[PDB]
Amino acid sequence: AAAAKKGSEQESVKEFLAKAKEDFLKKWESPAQNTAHLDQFERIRTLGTGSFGRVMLVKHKETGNHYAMKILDKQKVVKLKQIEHTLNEKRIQQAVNFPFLVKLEFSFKDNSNLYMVLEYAPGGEMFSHLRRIGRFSEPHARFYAAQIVLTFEYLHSLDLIYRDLKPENLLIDQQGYIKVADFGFAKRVKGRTWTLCGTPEYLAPEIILSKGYNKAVDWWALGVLIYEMAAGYPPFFADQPIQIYEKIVSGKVRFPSHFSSDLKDLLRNLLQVDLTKRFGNLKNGVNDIKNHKWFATTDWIAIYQRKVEAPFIPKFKSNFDDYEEEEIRVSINEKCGKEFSEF
Amino acid sequence: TTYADFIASGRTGRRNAIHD
Ligand SMILES: Cc1cc(Nc2cc(N3CCN(C)CC3)nc(Sc3ccc(NC(=O)C4CC4)cc3)n2)[nH]n1
């Protein structure tokens, strides 16, 4: 309807995206590299741990700016066969530029580790606020959902698939706006790809079924997210991943009684097993989503410009978790030099 | 309630990605 339509506002999108692509490609082809050193950073505390090492709150000594430094033990990345994913992660993250994406501010490596210095978000991740509060109101969830729709419009126009959408991966900034943090499974691919990766609750059925897949898996994951934000639980849950997968591939979804009829219609079109019928994957692409009823109150340009009043602003002062802290040990011999040469 | 079933399940904390 309004979705299968041009041209004046659709042309501005086109122009924005073409300029963004030109920007992106320069950085894609000539990646930033070795742009800091460990000793430039005062390590304040551990924020969290991933499979490859700690994420630390750090302070850049020469600007006093605060960042989150993701450390990756090279040997653990090799054992986990995540070399190419790690290289994707960094190559893509240094190249993108969007208001709702965590910036890769510096990267470097030493004998033992890879280091990714990221934009610090004082609010922490959405997961925590969502579990604490229980669930978000539809307008609240719509606000965040709108930011993901624009971010996906941006990433997809660059031939990127994100592959890890979930509340754990979305940071809330000082203005109450979102930043997508984790590029671990991001990939640049024209056409189809096959890696079984992602987080069980958020996997599209074509991933579970080893079908080979594209960017439409991101759109399904948006469906899970919106449902999770508004329900306070995932549309498919169980105690074990294999029980989750059977629920995902069955083709059935029950909605809570408080979901508006517009919300349910949106979600049915996002959580659609049939790629032929899944919103975001049709002739109108993202516009099927953008001009849906549930989004009728959304001013997209205002969202992009951060003009909309955030429903929640993080308290700034204690509140941090405590971890055992230990000094970074750097081996005297270089590990996995060849495998990571391009980092 | 479905919420009570969720809160009682073993998947209410941070969920790890798989890559096999
Ligand atoms: C990357 C990043 C992280 C942050 N900020 C924070 C902030 C935070 N806080 C703890 C709770 N108080 C209430 C707010 C501050 N807790 C975490 S715990 C945490 C740690 C790491 C990640 N994610 C990653 O490192 C992704 C990139 C691989 C998410 C949450 N991260 N800003 N930028």
Tab-separated table of C-alpha atoms and ligand atoms in Angstrom:
chain	number	residue	atom	x	y	z
A	1	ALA	CA	0.000	0.000	0.000
A	2	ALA	CA	1.974	2.960	1.391
A	3	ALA	CA	4.761	0.317	1.457
A	4	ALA	CA	4.733	-0.411	-2.304
A	5	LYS	CA	5.326	3.237	-3.090
A	6	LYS	CA	7.911	5.822	-4.109
A	7	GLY	CA	9.457	8.323	-4.551
A	8	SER	CA	10.337	11.537	-2.669
A	9	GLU	CA	10.979	10.130	0.825
A	10	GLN	CA	12.199	6.813	-0.655
A	11	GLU	CA	14.715	8.789	-2.761
A	12	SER	CA	16.182	10.557	0.304
A	13	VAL	CA	16.699	7.100	1.880
A	14	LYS	CA	18.421	6.002	-1.370
A	15	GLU	CA	20.703	9.071	-1.286
A	16	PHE	CA	21.571	8.616	2.401
A	17	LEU	CA	22.319	4.901	1.838
A	18	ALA	CA	24.473	5.512	-1.297
A	19	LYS	CA	26.613	8.035	0.573
A	20	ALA	CA	26.792	5.645	3.565
A	21	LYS	CA	27.881	2.781	1.265
A	22	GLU	CA	30.644	4.912	-0.304
A	23	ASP	CA	31.868	5.795	3.250
A	24	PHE	CA	31.705	2.108	4.316
A	25	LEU	CA	33.553	0.723	1.283
A	26	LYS	CA	36.607	2.944	1.762
A	27	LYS	CA	36.967	1.511	5.283
A	28	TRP	CA	36.055	-2.062	4.274
A	29	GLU	CA	38.895	-2.106	1.708
A	30	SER	CA	41.427	-0.240	3.848
A	31	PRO	CA	40.760	-1.212	7.492
A	32	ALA	CA	42.053	0.800	10.441
A	33	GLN	CA	44.709	-1.219	12.234
A	34	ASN	CA	47.064	-1.034	15.259
A	35	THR	CA	45.594	2.258	16.453
A	36	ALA	CA	46.429	2.044	20.132
A	37	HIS	CA	48.504	0.058	22.627
A	38	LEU	CA	47.551	-1.631	25.892
A	39	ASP	CA	49.666	0.741	28.061
A	40	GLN	CA	47.582	3.726	26.894
A	41	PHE	CA	44.690	2.384	28.956
A	42	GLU	CA	44.040	2.307	32.656
A	43	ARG	CA	42.045	-0.813	33.481
A	44	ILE	CA	39.378	0.109	36.007
A	45	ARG	CA	37.269	-3.067	36.366
A	46	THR	CA	35.847	-6.135	34.602
A	47	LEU	CA	32.402	-5.494	33.159
A	48	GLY	CA	31.751	-9.041	31.899
A	49	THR	CA	33.357	-12.163	30.405
A	50	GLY	CA	32.857	-13.759	27.002
A	51	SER	CA	34.165	-17.052	25.655
A	52	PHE	CA	37.424	-15.454	24.515
A	53	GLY	CA	38.253	-13.301	27.606
A	54	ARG	CA	37.143	-10.324	29.758
A	55	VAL	CA	35.503	-7.054	28.741
A	56	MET	CA	37.058	-4.310	30.912
A	57	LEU	CA	35.983	-0.783	31.742
A	58	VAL	CA	39.084	1.257	30.798
A	59	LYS	CA	40.241	4.894	30.704
A	60	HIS	CA	42.331	6.273	27.828
A	61	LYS	CA	45.221	8.004	29.665
A	62	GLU	CA	45.676	10.758	27.120
A	63	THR	CA	42.041	11.848	26.729
A	64	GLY	CA	40.570	10.607	30.036
A	65	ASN	CA	37.793	9.085	27.904
A	66	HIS	CA	36.181	5.820	29.109
A	67	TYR	CA	35.767	2.714	26.885
A	68	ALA	CA	34.921	-1.002	27.113
A	69	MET	CA	37.889	-3.056	26.064
A	70	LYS	CA	37.088	-6.510	24.729
A	71	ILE	CA	40.053	-8.818	25.114
A	72	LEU	CA	40.331	-11.994	22.998
A	73	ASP	CA	42.843	-14.679	23.840
A	74	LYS	CA	44.103	-15.663	20.349
A	75	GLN	CA	44.616	-19.348	21.338
A	76	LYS	CA	41.004	-19.718	22.568
A	77	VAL	CA	39.722	-18.167	19.295
A	78	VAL	CA	41.688	-20.757	17.330
A	79	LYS	CA	40.448	-23.697	19.462
A	80	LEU	CA	36.898	-22.489	19.012
A	81	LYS	CA	37.414	-22.213	15.235
A	82	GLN	CA	36.311	-18.558	15.297
A	83	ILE	CA	39.250	-17.043	13.468
A	84	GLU	CA	37.285	-15.937	10.387
A	85	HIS	CA	34.323	-14.742	12.527
A	86	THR	CA	36.686	-12.665	14.660
A	87	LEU	CA	38.288	-11.139	11.543
A	88	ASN	CA	34.805	-10.367	10.151
A	89	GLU	CA	33.813	-8.888	13.509
A	90	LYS	CA	36.650	-6.388	13.552
A	91	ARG	CA	36.751	-5.605	9.813
A	92	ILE	CA	33.032	-4.871	9.785
A	93	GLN	CA	32.863	-3.012	13.062
A	94	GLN	CA	35.656	-0.504	12.196
A	95	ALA	CA	33.973	0.165	8.868
A	96	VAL	CA	30.370	0.959	9.895
A	97	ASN	CA	28.937	4.296	11.042
A	98	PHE	CA	25.395	4.627	12.356
A	99	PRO	CA	23.916	6.333	15.424
A	100	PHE	CA	22.703	3.024	16.870
A	101	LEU	CA	25.899	0.992	16.467
A	102	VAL	CA	28.665	0.729	19.088
A	103	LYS	CA	31.800	2.351	17.635
A	104	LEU	CA	35.034	0.426	17.401
A	105	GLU	CA	37.255	3.247	18.676
A	106	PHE	CA	40.653	1.488	18.579
A	107	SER	CA	42.017	-2.012	17.984
A	108	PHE	CA	45.422	-3.626	18.438
A	109	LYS	CA	46.992	-6.948	19.330
A	110	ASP	CA	49.974	-8.252	21.236
A	111	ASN	CA	51.694	-11.610	21.709
A	112	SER	CA	48.706	-13.149	23.496
A	113	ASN	CA	45.554	-11.176	22.840
A	114	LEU	CA	43.399	-9.227	20.453
A	115	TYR	CA	41.955	-5.995	21.796
A	116	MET	CA	38.813	-4.208	20.736
A	117	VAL	CA	38.217	-0.851	22.378
A	118	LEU	CA	34.550	-0.041	22.146
A	119	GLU	CA	32.286	2.888	22.915
A	120	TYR	CA	31.189	2.830	26.576
A	121	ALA	CA	27.423	2.908	27.177
A	122	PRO	CA	26.740	4.030	30.755
A	123	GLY	CA	23.292	2.369	30.892
A	124	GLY	CA	24.501	-1.221	30.427
A	125	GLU	CA	22.559	-3.686	28.300
A	126	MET	CA	18.794	-3.945	27.727
A	127	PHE	CA	18.666	-7.567	28.913
A	128	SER	CA	19.206	-6.405	32.529
A	129	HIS	CA	16.622	-3.645	32.510
A	130	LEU	CA	14.116	-5.955	30.764
A	131	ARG	CA	14.503	-8.832	33.241
A	132	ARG	CA	14.310	-6.384	36.221
A	133	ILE	CA	11.225	-4.460	34.976
A	134	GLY	CA	9.565	-7.614	33.640
A	135	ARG	CA	8.362	-6.211	30.305
A	136	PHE	CA	8.085	-2.991	28.395
A	137	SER	CA	4.903	-1.230	27.316
A	138	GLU	CA	4.211	-1.311	23.563
A	139	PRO	CA	5.265	2.336	23.050
A	140	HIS	CA	8.478	1.650	24.971
A	141	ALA	CA	9.261	-1.483	22.954
A	142	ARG	CA	8.258	0.351	19.731
A	143	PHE	CA	10.829	3.035	20.431
A	144	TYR	CA	13.708	0.514	20.630
A	145	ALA	CA	12.247	-1.632	17.845
A	146	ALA	CA	12.262	1.425	15.552
A	147	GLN	CA	16.001	1.874	16.110
A	148	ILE	CA	16.665	-1.752	15.213
A	149	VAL	CA	14.582	-1.388	12.000
A	150	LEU	CA	16.719	1.557	10.858
A	151	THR	CA	19.970	-0.160	11.873
A	152	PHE	CA	18.992	-3.224	9.885
A	153	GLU	CA	18.073	-1.022	6.901
A	154	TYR	CA	21.579	0.467	7.133
A	155	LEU	CA	23.484	-2.838	7.612
A	156	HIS	CA	21.547	-4.755	4.997
A	157	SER	CA	22.158	-2.034	2.330
A	158	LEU	CA	25.865	-2.729	2.909
A	159	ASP	CA	25.390	-6.500	2.310
A	160	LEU	CA	25.835	-7.204	6.038
A	161	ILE	CA	23.901	-9.788	8.034
A	162	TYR	CA	24.023	-9.190	11.773
A	163	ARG	CA	23.056	-12.675	13.112
A	164	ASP	CA	23.041	-12.006	16.833
A	165	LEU	CA	20.097	-9.771	17.687
A	166	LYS	CA	19.018	-10.190	21.344
A	167	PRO	CA	18.559	-7.892	24.411
A	168	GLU	CA	22.016	-8.995	25.645
A	169	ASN	CA	23.584	-7.321	22.610
A	170	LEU	CA	21.821	-3.963	22.829
A	171	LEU	CA	23.256	-1.203	25.010
A	172	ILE	CA	21.293	1.784	26.408
A	173	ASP	CA	23.189	5.046	26.184
A	174	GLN	CA	23.054	8.256	28.266
A	175	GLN	CA	20.111	9.587	26.118
A	176	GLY	CA	18.155	6.296	26.504
A	177	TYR	CA	18.908	5.325	22.866
A	178	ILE	CA	20.192	1.932	21.679
A	179	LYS	CA	23.611	0.804	20.536
A	180	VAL	CA	24.143	-2.676	19.009
A	181	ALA	CA	27.341	-3.979	20.559
A	182	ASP	CA	28.454	-7.410	19.411
A	183	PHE	CA	29.669	-7.985	15.819
A	184	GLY	CA	30.935	-11.518	16.501
A	185	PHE	CA	28.711	-13.153	13.863
A	186	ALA	CA	28.287	-10.181	11.462
A	187	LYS	CA	29.121	-11.192	7.873
A	188	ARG	CA	29.394	-9.493	4.477
A	189	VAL	CA	27.831	-11.728	1.890
A	190	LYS	CA	25.912	-11.149	-1.338
A	191	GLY	CA	23.535	-14.102	-1.553
A	192	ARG	CA	23.473	-17.061	0.859
A	193	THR	CA	25.448	-18.416	3.777
A	194	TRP	CA	25.315	-21.537	5.905
A	195	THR	CA	26.991	-21.186	9.296
A	196	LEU	CA	24.889	-22.470	12.177
A	197	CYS	CA	25.389	-19.583	14.622
A	198	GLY	CA	23.287	-17.229	16.685
A	199	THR	CA	21.459	-17.690	19.977
A	200	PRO	CA	18.888	-20.577	20.196
A	201	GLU	CA	15.737	-18.528	21.090
A	202	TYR	CA	16.443	-16.117	18.205
A	203	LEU	CA	17.339	-18.592	15.411
A	204	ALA	CA	15.213	-18.488	12.254
A	205	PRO	CA	13.893	-21.966	11.254
A	206	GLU	CA	15.951	-21.986	8.014
A	207	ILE	CA	19.069	-21.832	10.198
A	208	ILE	CA	17.965	-24.772	12.415
A	209	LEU	CA	17.031	-26.748	9.288
A	210	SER	CA	20.473	-26.201	7.642
A	211	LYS	CA	18.812	-24.612	4.659
A	212	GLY	CA	21.276	-21.890	3.771
A	213	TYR	CA	20.001	-18.404	4.513
A	214	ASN	CA	20.234	-14.643	4.044
A	215	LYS	CA	19.371	-11.358	5.766
A	216	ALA	CA	15.787	-12.477	6.325
A	217	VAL	CA	17.075	-14.270	9.448
A	218	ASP	CA	17.671	-10.769	10.948
A	219	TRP	CA	13.995	-9.911	10.366
A	220	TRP	CA	12.777	-13.036	12.112
A	221	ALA	CA	15.104	-12.132	15.059
A	222	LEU	CA	13.480	-8.658	15.223
A	223	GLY	CA	10.190	-10.578	15.648
A	224	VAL	CA	11.553	-12.494	18.630
A	225	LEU	CA	12.923	-9.256	20.124
A	226	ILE	CA	9.705	-7.282	19.870
A	227	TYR	CA	7.809	-10.197	21.394
A	228	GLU	CA	10.391	-10.583	24.152
A	229	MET	CA	10.371	-6.845	24.983
A	230	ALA	CA	6.552	-6.642	25.137
A	231	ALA	CA	5.828	-10.047	26.709
A	232	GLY	CA	8.765	-10.221	29.132
A	233	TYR	CA	9.551	-13.717	27.845
A	234	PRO	CA	10.582	-15.219	24.419
A	235	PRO	CA	7.999	-16.569	21.946
A	236	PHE	CA	9.792	-19.939	22.044
A	237	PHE	CA	11.367	-21.117	25.296
A	238	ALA	CA	12.210	-24.352	27.045
A	239	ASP	CA	14.928	-25.745	29.297
A	240	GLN	CA	17.056	-27.122	26.462
A	241	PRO	CA	18.021	-25.771	22.999
A	242	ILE	CA	16.614	-28.844	21.207
A	243	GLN	CA	13.182	-28.257	22.763
A	244	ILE	CA	13.392	-24.622	21.633
A	245	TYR	CA	14.216	-25.681	18.040
A	246	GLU	CA	11.168	-27.946	17.749
A	247	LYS	CA	8.985	-25.016	18.843
A	248	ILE	CA	10.616	-22.717	16.250
A	249	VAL	CA	10.216	-25.190	13.350
A	250	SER	CA	6.636	-26.210	14.268
A	251	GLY	CA	5.106	-22.983	12.914
A	252	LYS	CA	3.148	-22.033	16.039
A	253	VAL	CA	3.341	-18.934	18.246
A	254	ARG	CA	0.967	-17.945	21.073
A	255	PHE	CA	0.601	-14.282	21.929
A	256	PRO	CA	-0.273	-12.868	25.381
A	257	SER	CA	-3.763	-11.355	25.741
A	258	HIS	CA	-2.365	-7.861	26.361
A	259	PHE	CA	-0.761	-7.680	22.903
A	260	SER	CA	-2.642	-5.159	20.730
A	261	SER	CA	-4.097	-6.587	17.542
A	262	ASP	CA	-1.631	-4.438	15.516
A	263	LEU	CA	1.339	-5.885	17.470
A	264	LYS	CA	0.135	-9.444	16.799
A	265	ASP	CA	-0.306	-8.766	13.094
A	266	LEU	CA	3.205	-7.349	12.872
A	267	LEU	CA	4.671	-10.357	14.733
A	268	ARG	CA	2.826	-12.910	12.612
A	269	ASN	CA	4.421	-11.364	9.531
A	270	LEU	CA	7.909	-11.325	11.153
A	271	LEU	CA	7.749	-14.799	12.770
A	272	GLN	CA	6.775	-16.375	9.464
A	273	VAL	CA	8.447	-19.666	8.514
A	274	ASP	CA	7.634	-18.966	4.866
A	275	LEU	CA	10.405	-16.711	3.447
A	276	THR	CA	8.004	-15.909	0.603
A	277	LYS	CA	5.684	-14.227	3.145
A	278	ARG	CA	8.097	-12.842	5.805
A	279	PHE	CA	8.082	-9.066	6.241
A	280	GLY	CA	11.401	-7.481	5.299
A	281	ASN	CA	11.938	-10.251	2.706
A	282	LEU	CA	9.311	-9.092	0.175
A	283	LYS	CA	9.341	-6.816	-2.895
A	284	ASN	CA	8.851	-3.772	-0.617
A	285	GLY	CA	11.745	-4.862	1.639
A	286	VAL	CA	11.898	-2.820	4.846
A	287	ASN	CA	8.927	-0.576	3.932
A	288	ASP	CA	6.474	-3.426	4.692
A	289	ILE	CA	7.783	-3.035	8.257
A	290	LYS	CA	8.095	0.782	8.278
A	291	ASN	CA	4.526	1.484	7.053
A	292	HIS	CA	2.892	-1.203	9.206
A	293	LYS	CA	0.042	-0.011	11.536
A	294	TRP	CA	1.947	-0.716	14.787
A	295	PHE	CA	4.523	1.872	13.579
A	296	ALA	CA	2.029	4.513	12.371
A	297	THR	CA	3.002	6.889	15.211
A	298	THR	CA	6.730	6.506	14.457
A	299	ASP	CA	8.555	9.431	12.950
A	300	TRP	CA	11.591	7.731	11.447
A	301	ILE	CA	13.694	10.820	10.765
A	302	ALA	CA	13.114	12.020	14.359
A	303	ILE	CA	14.175	8.570	15.617
A	304	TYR	CA	17.383	8.725	13.481
A	305	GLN	CA	18.063	12.274	14.694
A	306	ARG	CA	17.441	11.288	18.327
A	307	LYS	CA	14.711	13.937	18.644
A	308	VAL	CA	12.233	11.546	20.299
A	309	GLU	CA	11.984	11.570	24.102
A	310	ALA	CA	13.409	8.352	25.535
A	311	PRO	CA	11.030	6.335	27.820
A	312	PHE	CA	13.898	5.468	30.163
A	313	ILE	CA	17.110	7.329	31.048
A	314	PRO	CA	19.841	5.466	33.003
A	315	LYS	CA	20.649	6.625	36.532
A	316	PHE	CA	24.202	7.982	36.742
A	317	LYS	CA	25.964	8.209	40.111
A	318	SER	CA	28.213	0.730	43.481
A	319	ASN	CA	25.831	-0.812	40.921
A	320	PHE	CA	28.532	-2.865	39.155
A	321	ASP	CA	28.984	-6.598	39.620
A	322	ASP	CA	32.113	-7.804	41.398
A	323	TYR	CA	34.550	-10.087	39.653
A	324	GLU	CA	37.893	-11.417	40.767
A	325	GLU	CA	40.396	-9.096	39.105
A	326	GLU	CA	43.791	-10.230	37.832
A	327	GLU	CA	46.595	-8.640	35.799
A	328	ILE	CA	46.775	-9.239	32.023
A	329	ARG	CA	49.630	-11.625	31.306
A	330	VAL	CA	51.315	-11.104	27.956
A	331	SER	CA	53.362	-14.052	26.696
A	332	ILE	CA	56.980	-13.452	25.568
A	333	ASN	CA	56.306	-15.466	22.398
A	334	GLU	CA	53.835	-14.491	19.682
A	335	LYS	CA	50.839	-16.797	19.400
A	336	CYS	CA	48.902	-17.396	16.194
A	337	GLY	CA	50.715	-14.669	14.262
A	338	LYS	CA	49.711	-15.844	10.804
A	339	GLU	CA	46.062	-16.512	11.626
A	340	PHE	CA	45.453	-12.952	12.812
A	341	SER	CA	47.876	-10.997	10.611
A	342	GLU	CA	45.144	-8.797	9.175
A	343	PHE	CA	43.722	-7.769	12.607
B	1	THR	CA	0.929	-18.619	33.676
B	2	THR	CA	3.450	-18.519	30.844
B	3	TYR	CA	5.384	-15.799	32.672
B	4	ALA	CA	5.616	-18.035	35.812
B	5	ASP	CA	6.825	-20.921	33.606
B	6	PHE	CA	9.507	-18.647	32.100
B	7	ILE	CA	10.709	-17.270	35.436
B	8	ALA	CA	10.948	-20.828	36.755
B	9	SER	CA	12.906	-22.036	33.646
B	10	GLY	CA	16.732	-22.379	33.403
B	11	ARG	CA	17.026	-19.771	30.610
B	12	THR	CA	16.268	-16.464	32.348
B	13	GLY	CA	19.910	-15.372	32.546
B	14	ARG	CA	22.253	-14.194	29.790
B	15	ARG	CA	22.084	-16.564	26.846
B	16	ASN	CA	25.242	-17.686	25.077
B	17	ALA	CA	25.491	-17.834	21.340
B	18	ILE	CA	26.232	-21.130	19.714
B	19	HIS	CA	28.679	-21.551	16.977
B	20	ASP	CA	28.795	-25.281	17.521
C	1	LIG	C1	30.693	-2.840	25.275
C	1	LIG	C2	30.106	-1.928	26.362
C	1	LIG	C3	29.642	-2.278	27.564
C	1	LIG	C4	29.255	-1.100	28.105
C	1	LIG	N1	28.711	-0.815	29.305
C	1	LIG	C5	28.368	-1.640	30.304
C	1	LIG	C6	27.864	-1.089	31.490
C	1	LIG	C7	27.494	-1.930	32.544
C	1	LIG	N2	26.963	-1.443	33.764
C	1	LIG	C8	26.606	-2.396	34.874
C	1	LIG	C9	25.237	-2.044	35.471
C	1	LIG	N3	25.116	-0.584	35.703
C	1	LIG	C10	23.772	-0.318	36.224
C	1	LIG	C11	25.286	0.223	34.471
C	1	LIG	C12	26.716	0.022	33.957
C	1	LIG	N4	27.631	-3.253	32.377
C	1	LIG	C13	28.115	-3.765	31.233
C	1	LIG	S1	28.263	-5.502	31.146
C	1	LIG	C14	28.537	-5.841	29.423
C	1	LIG	C15	29.819	-6.140	28.968
C	1	LIG	C16	30.029	-6.425	27.614
C	1	LIG	C17	28.967	-6.406	26.699
C	1	LIG	N5	29.120	-6.686	25.389
C	1	LIG	C18	30.252	-6.827	24.702
C	1	LIG	O1	31.400	-6.689	25.148
C	1	LIG	C19	30.022	-7.160	23.241
C	1	LIG	C20	30.983	-6.457	22.259
C	1	LIG	C21	31.130	-7.964	22.552
C	1	LIG	C22	27.682	-6.117	27.163
C	1	LIG	C23	27.470	-5.848	28.524
C	1	LIG	N6	28.480	-2.975	30.209
C	1	LIG	N7	29.480	-0.137	27.220
C	1	LIG	N8	29.989	-0.615	26.208
